[PDB]
């Protein structure tokens, strides 16, 4: 009754209620202290960045957009002249920025604007102080967190060479989570480990034929391709959510490094007891309850695994924007074999399926959330899961807390 390896996954595409890759910038930039993200696109794109950023917008964030004017549509490069004085104006604001991302959008892509080549040129014109990259963030080729991926992938080709045997943890983890990760992996004896992205441009990891990397986040296909292209080799692991997930994750690394079981169990015992006890606080309210997840982030499958195995949740339909066969296989092997899997979305179709299942708890974005509450279904807003500390041992309680709460509230509000 556990294992969805040979489960038929539903490939589906129609009306979609999801974010574009641009939104990644909102939380991504916080991590990369040294960098600036300049969207080349619409007022629509600025309008989006503003909406997703919420209160952050007033804290002079290290992002913004160059919005296309009518005169830039008129079939006239440059184009490249505009963007250039627009960049110099930005970098002068602003001398502290050391990495600049030219982030492609639907409008910038439909007008076939060569932002790749722009990155190339502007790096030429602003070396060595500031380095400039190009990646796509459009609705056209990208969903929400897929934007983190395309960002890091653009970086991979230009990372230094090394023949050193080192570990890279990939995926922008929140600052406290990253610390706990480094600590645990030090304590096991895992020799030099580096995050990607790094906290500052000048301490990025090197890659080479002897590099190992493990993914901390599921949505990193392209970065994985790019890393593999430079000779670096992945460690397969289920994703570090909950007590089981975190142990399986650390274990795959221990094993890759030949850390003894005597030592693994020693380093890992207390943080595990801690986590397991934190989770039981929510088991009353969570257990036996049926779950439904609309696609948003690619985090749904692993979290569905966390809620089934560690919170006694009954699984329903669990959808994801993208399902990467090899990366997700460890987590799929642990999913309850009743689970209906979907990759993509036909929104009206998927809502008919939803109303039919009548699930106890539904993960979705704010487009759907209240409309559904009105229909009588409790909902948990998906996007919180991408920026809240949720990974590893210490946040395992907090994680379950995120799903128990809307159900506890629902109860509390009916006397």
């Amino acid at each position: 009754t556990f294992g969805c390896t040979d489960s038929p996954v539903r490939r589906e595409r129609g009306q979609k209620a999801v974010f574009c890759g641009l939104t990644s910038i909102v939380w991504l930039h916080r991590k990369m202290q040294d960098a600036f993200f300049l969207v080349v696109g619409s007022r629509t794109c600025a309008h989006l960045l503003q909406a997703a950023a919420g209160v952050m917008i007033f804290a002079e964030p290290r992002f913004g957009t160059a919005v296309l004017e009518e005169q830039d549509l008129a079939g006239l490069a440059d184009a490249h002249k505009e963007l250039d004085r627009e960049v110099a104006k930005l970098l002068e604001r602003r001398p502290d920025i050391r990495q600049l991302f030219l982030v492609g959008s639907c409008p910038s892509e439909v007008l076939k604007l060569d932002l790749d080549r722009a990155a190339e040129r502007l790096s030429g014109l602003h070396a060595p102080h500031v380095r400039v990259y190009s990646y796509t963030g459009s609705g056209l080729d990208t969903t929400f967190t897929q934007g983190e991926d395309t960002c890091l992938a653009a970086m991979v080709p230009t990372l230094d060479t090394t023949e050193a045997a080192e570990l890279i943890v990939v995926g922008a983890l929140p600052d406290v989570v990253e610390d706990q990760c480094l600590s645990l992996l030090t304590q096991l004896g895992v020799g030099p480990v580096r995050m990607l992205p790094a906290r500052r441009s000048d301490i990025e990891p090197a890659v080479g034929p002897n590099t190992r990397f493990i993914l901390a986040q599921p949505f990193l296909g392209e970065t994985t391709g790019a890393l593999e292209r430079r000779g670096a080799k992945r460690i397969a692991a289920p994703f570090p959510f909950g007590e089981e997930g975190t142990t399986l994750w650390l274990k795959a690394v221990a094993d890759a490094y030949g850390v003894s079981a005597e030592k693994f169990e020693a380093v890992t015992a207390a943080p595990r007891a801690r986590a397991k006890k934190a989770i039981a606080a929510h088991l009353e309210t969570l257990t036996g309850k049926s779950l439904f997840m609309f696609p948003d982030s690619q985090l749904e499958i692993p979290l569905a695994r966390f809620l089934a195995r560690e919170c006694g949740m009954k699984t329903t339909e669990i959808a994801t924007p993208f399902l990467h066969k090899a990366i997700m296989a460890p987590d799929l092997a642990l999913l309850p074999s009743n689970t209906a899997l979907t990759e993509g979305q036909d929104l009206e179709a998927q809502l008919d399926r939803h109303e039919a299942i009548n699930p106890d708890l539904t993960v979705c974005g704010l487009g759907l959330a209240n409309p559904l509450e009105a229909k009588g279904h409790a909902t948990k807003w998906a996007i919180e899961l991408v920026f809240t500390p949720v990974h590893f041992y210490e946040q395992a309680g907090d994680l379950a807390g995120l799903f128990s709460r809307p159900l506890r509230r629902r109860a509390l509000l009916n006397g």
Partner: protein
């Protein structure tokens, strides 16, 4: 290209949604990339809405571009109709769809559905949110309103209440009741609450209350020529403005002017000895044309502030605002750049700011009292409580709203002064 962070207005197609979500039994179909649905957040989240907006996107993406984009639009349209059977529909283009060759009107008529599909033209790169709302609504009206027999009773319409409108809900409630104290009944109120079949019954009203020029003027002007209906030029925000508004209505209809003032408390609150420190306090006023013009009068002539800076973000109100500003000895600031506002405020050095959510933040950065007087809507300035800006209760609301941050400021300032 313009380096952009904060934006007072969104793209015009958001204004379209704003009209469509306002209405009922009308589906809007936007030709646009997967992703642009982020704008639903706005309606379901900020306005607390209990249903999906009647908006749907064709959702083209990288694997279905080229000659597919026109096909996907046709489906978008087809589906919306089959699924919801609305009285009418509208079709328009997102900014990304604007760079394509697809004719919404061509595509639209070739499908011919058994209801009207109104095509809207929203230039995404030159115009913004407000115009989009205005144009959409004018377009809907031009397509649906016919000249009619006048109603037996003296009635009127309400033009320009939309979805993400600053206090539209309660403004409409308050204006209705003050019109009804003069025995004037409301015919249709639109877009907000109206269906396409209501737009057809617009002709039978005697005149129109143009509540919000930014979202109602085009439709008001069409209705004037097409239905020989006058429309009110005075927006009833402030006590002075409300009397003038009622006066205007009286001359339009010939009805005598009646008021209920038993619960109007602003004049006395402002006259009371308790207010005399307000006298000459320097106010900076920013927001959309309508609310700024209205705010400045209340500030100067009703509360006794000295209006020390005056402007707005929407080009469409530049002239009425310029006229207004001159009466105070000021030259209107017209900009959508908040950095331009940050500067005009530092220069004007006011003791209080009346603006939008952004001015609220500038005000905090400079350590100065602030109140929000216009859109863009945040979730906070979307109350559960009754909070009109218009008419007599509106005037009470405004006094409390504006004076409160002033007393909190004097009070914080005093507390820290006697702490050593």
């Amino acid at each position: 290209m313009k380096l952009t962070l904060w934006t007072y207005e969104g793209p015009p197609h958001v204004g379209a949604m704003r009209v469509a979500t306002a209405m009922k039994d009308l589906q809007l179909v936007l030709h646009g990339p997967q992703g642009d649905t982020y704008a639903d957040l706005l309606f379901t989240m900020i306005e607390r809405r209990n249903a999906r907006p009647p908006v749907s996107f064709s959702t083209f993406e990288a694997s279905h571009m080229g000659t597919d984009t026109a096909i996907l639009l046709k489906d978008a349209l087809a589906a919306a109709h089959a699924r919801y059977k609305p009285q009418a529909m509208a079709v328009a283009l997102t900014c990304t769809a604007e760079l394509l060759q697809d004719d919404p009107n061509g595509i639209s008529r070739a499908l011919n559905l058994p209801v009207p599909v109104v095509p809207l033209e929203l230039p995404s790169y030159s115009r913004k949110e407000n115009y989009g709302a205005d144009e959409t609504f004018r377009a809907l009206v031009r397509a649906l309103a016919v000249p009619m027999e006048r109603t037996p009773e003296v009635t009127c319409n309400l033009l320009g209440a939309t979805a993400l409108g600053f206090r539209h809900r309660d403004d409409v409630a308050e204006v209705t009741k003050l019109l009804a104290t003069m025995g004037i009944k409301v015919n249709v109120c639109a877009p907000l609450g109206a269906s396409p079949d209501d737009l057809r019954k617009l002709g039978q009203a005697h005149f129109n209350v143009l509540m919000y020029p930014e979202t109602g003027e085009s439709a008001a002007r069409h209705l004037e020529r097409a239905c020989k209906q006058p429309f009110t030029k005075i927006v009833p925000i402030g006590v002075g403005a409300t009397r003038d508004f009622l006066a205007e209505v009286s001359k339009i209809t010939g009805l005598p002017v009646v008021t209920d003032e038993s619960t109007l408390r602003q004049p006395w609150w402002s006259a009371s000895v308790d207010s005399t420190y307000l006298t000459g306090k320097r106010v900076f006023i920013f927001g959309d044309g309508t609310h700024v013009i209205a705010a400045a009068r209340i500030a100067a002539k009703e509360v006794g502030f000295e209006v020390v800076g005056m402007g707005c973000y929407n080009r469409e109100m530049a002239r009425p605002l310029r006229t207004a500003a001159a009466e105070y000895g000021l030259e209107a600031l017209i900009t959508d750049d908040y950095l331009e506002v940050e500067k005009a405020i530092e220069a004007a050095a006011p003791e209080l700011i009346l603006g939008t959510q952004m001015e609220r933040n500038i005000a905090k950065k400079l350590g100065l009292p602030c109140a929000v007087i216009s859109a863009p809507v945040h979730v906070q300035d979307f109350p559960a409580r009754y909070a009109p800006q218009m008419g007599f209760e509106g005037a009470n609301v405004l006094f409390d709203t504006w004076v409160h941050p002033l007393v909190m400021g004097l009070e914080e300032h005093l507390l820290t002064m006697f702490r050593e």
